[PDB]
Design a protein. Structure first.
Ligand SMILES: CNCc1ccc2c(c1)[C@@H](CC[C@@H](O)CO)[C@H](CNC(=N)N)[C@H]2NC(=O)C(=O)Nc1ccc(Cl)c(F)c1
Ligand SMILES: *[C@@H]1O[C@H](CO)[C@@H](O)[C@H](O)[C@H]1NC(C)=O
Ligand SMILES: *[C@@H]1O[C@H](CO)[C@@H](O)[C@H](O)[C@H]1NC(C)=O
Ligand SMILES: *[C@@H]1O[C@H](CO)[C@@H](O)[C@H](O)[C@H]1NC(C)=O
Ligand SMILES: *[C@@H]1O[C@H](CO)[C@@H](O)[C@H](O)[C@H]1NC(C)=O
Ligand SMILES: *[C@@H]1O[C@H](CO)[C@@H](O)[C@H](O)[C@H]1NC(C)=O
Ligand SMILES: *[C@@H]1O[C@H](CO)[C@@H](O)[C@H](O)[C@H]1NC(C)=O
Length: 335
C-alpha cells in the first residue's frame, strides 16, 4: 500500500474545473513513458479489492467538492449554503502513478475479466488517461475492450454484485436540452444498440447456458440509479432508460421490445436542481440550468447491470468505485 499521485495534461490557462484541480493536485504527464513486458511472469489481479480505486475515488470527491459547489448542501438537518457559480465542466483524462520504490503492474491479456492469474504482464509508471466520468447504468467516455466483449463481476452467483459489461465497440449517445427549460432528450441509433445487446446477451448466455436473457428497466430505488444519469456541461441530466433496456435474447437471437421511431431510440431527460449526492449520503441543491443549447456527445463503452427458467438483467450503478474499476482493472500497485 502506497500513496499514488496523479498526472494530467491540464492547462493552467483553462477555466474548466478538471484543469484547475489538476494544475495544483497532479503533475505534468511524462512525455517519455517506459513500459517493460514480462511475458514469462504471471501475476494475480483482483479488480474488486484494489486500493487504486479508493484513491481515485477520494481524488474525484475532492475534485467535485472544490469544483461543483452546490447552492445548498443538506446532510440530515444541517444545511450549508455557499456560492454556486455556473462553471465550465468537461472531464479530462487522469493518469495515476506510483512513486519510487513502487511500480504499476499492467495485465495485457485482452480477455482478462479482472480476477485471477494474468500470464502476460507489463510494468509501467502510470496508468492510461482515465476520464472521471460520474454516471449510472451507462459507462461513458471510457476505453473499449480490444477483443471480445468482457463480463466482469465480483461474484456472478451473487445477484447483489454489480456486473460490468465492457464493450469492444462504442455506441454513440447524444443528449441535449435544446435551445420547459428542464426538458431534454438523448438520441441513440437503434441499429447499433440492437447489435450491442445482441452480443452482450451472447456473452451473458455463456455465463448462464435454458435461462433466456432478458433486459428490463431498473426495479426501483432513487431516481439517480433508476435512470441513466450523467453530468453534462455542469448540468445534471436524468434520462429514462425504459425504452433502452427493453429486450429479450432467446435461442441465439436479439429482439428489442423498446419503443423506437425512424431507427432511433429517444430517452426523455429532465435536468434536476435537487441532487442525491454520490460522494456521501445527503442532498445537494444547484442553480437552474444555463440558457442556450446544452448538448453532450458521448460514446457508451460499458454497461452496469444487476441480475434479479429465465435470467433478467436491469441497469444499475451508483457506487462510483465501479466506474473507476471499469478502467483500473488491468493495474495493480506493487512494491
Ligand atoms: C450496489 N450499489 C448500491 C448503491 C446505490 C446507490 C448509492 C450507494 C450504493 C452509495 C455509495 C457510496 C459510496 O460510494 C461511498 O463513497 C451512495 C450513498 N449516497 C446516497 N444514498 N445518497 C448512493 N449513491 C447515489 O445516491 C448517487 O450516486 N446519486 C447520483 C447523483 C448524481 C449523479 Cl450524476 C449520479 F450518477 C448518481
Ligand atoms: C474470471 O476469471 C477467473 C479466473 O479463472 C474465474 O475464476 C472467474 O470465475 C471469472 N469471472 C467471471 C465473471 O467470468
Ligand atoms: C465484439 O465482441 C463480440 C463478442 O462479444 C464479437 O461477436 C464481435 O465480433 C466483436 N466485434 C468487433 C471485434 O468489432
Ligand atoms: C459467491 O456467491 C455464492 C452464493 O451466491 C457463494 O457460494 C460464494 O461463497 C460467494 N463468494 C465467493 C464465490 O467467494
Ligand atoms: C420511465 O418512463 C416510463 C414510461 O415512459 C415510466 O413508466 C417510468 O415511470 C419512467 N421511469 C422513471 C424513473 O422516470
Ligand atoms: C418496453 O417498452 C414499452 C414501450 O414501447 C413498455 O410498454 C414496456 O413496459 C417496456 N418493458 C418493460 C418496462 O419491461
Ligand atoms: C464525453 O466526451 C465528449 C467529447 O470530449 C463530451 O462532449 C461529452 O460531454 C463527454 N461526456 C461526459 C459525460 O462528460
Amino acid at each position: 500500500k502506497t500513496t499514488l499521485f496523479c498526472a494530467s495534461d491540464a492547462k493552467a490557462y483553462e477555466k474548466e474545473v478538471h484543469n484547475v484541480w489538476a494544475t495544483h493536485a497532479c503533475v505534468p504527464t511524462d512525455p517519455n513513458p517506459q513500459e517493460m513486458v514480462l511475458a514469462n511472469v504471471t501475476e494475480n489481479f483482483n479488480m474488486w479489492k484494489n486500493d487504486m480505486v479508493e484513491q481515485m475515488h477520494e481524488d474525484i470527491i475532492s475534485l467535485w467538492d472544490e469544483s461543483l459547489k452546490p447552492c445548498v448542501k443538506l446532510t440530515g438537518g444541517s444545511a450549508i449554503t455557499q456560492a454556486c457559480p455556473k462553471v465550465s465542466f468537461d472531464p479530462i483524462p487522469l493518469h495515476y502513478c506510483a512513486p519510487a520504490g513502487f511500480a504499476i503492474l499492467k495485465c495485457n491479456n485482452k480477455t482478462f475479466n479482472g480476477t485471477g492469474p494474468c500470464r502476460n504482464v507489463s510494468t509501467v509508471q502510470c496508468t492510461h488517461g482515465i476520464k472521471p466520468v460520474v454516471s449510472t447504468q451507462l459507462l461513458l467516455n471510457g476505453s473499449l475492450a480490444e477483443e471480445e466483449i468482457i463480463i466482469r463481476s465480483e461474484n456472478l452467483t451473487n445477484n447483489a454484485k454489480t456486473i460490468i459489461v465492457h464493450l469492444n465497440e462504442s455506441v454513440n449517445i447524444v443528449c441535449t436540452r435544446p435551445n420547459n427549460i428542464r426538458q431534454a432528450h438523448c438520441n441513440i441509433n437503434e441499429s447499433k444498440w440492437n447489435n450491442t445487446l445482441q452480443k452482450v446477451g451472447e456473452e451473458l448466455a455463456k455465463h448462464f447456458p435454458s435461462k433466456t436473457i432478458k433486459f428490463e428497466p431498473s426495479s426501483g430505488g432513487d431516481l439517480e440509479i433508476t435512470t441513466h444519469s450523467f453530468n453534462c456541461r455542469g448540468e445534471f441530466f436524468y434520462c429514462n432508460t425504459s425504452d433502452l433496456f427493453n429486450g429479450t435474447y432467446r435461442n441465439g437471437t436479439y429482439n428489442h421490445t423498446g419503443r423506437s421511431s425512424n431507427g432511433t431510440i429517444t430517452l426523455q431527460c429532465k435536468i434536476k436542481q435537487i441532487i442525491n449526492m454520490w460522494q456521501e449520503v445527503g442532498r445537494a441543491i444547484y442553480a437552474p440550468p444555463i440558457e442556450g443549447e446544452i448538448t453532450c456527445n458521448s460514446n457508451i463503452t460499458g454497461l452496469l447491470l444487476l441480475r434479479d427458467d429465465t435470467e433478467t438483467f436491469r441497469p444499475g450503478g451508483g457506487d462510483m468505485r465501479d466506474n473507476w474499476r471499469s478502467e483500473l482493472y488491468k493495474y495493480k500497485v506493487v512494491e
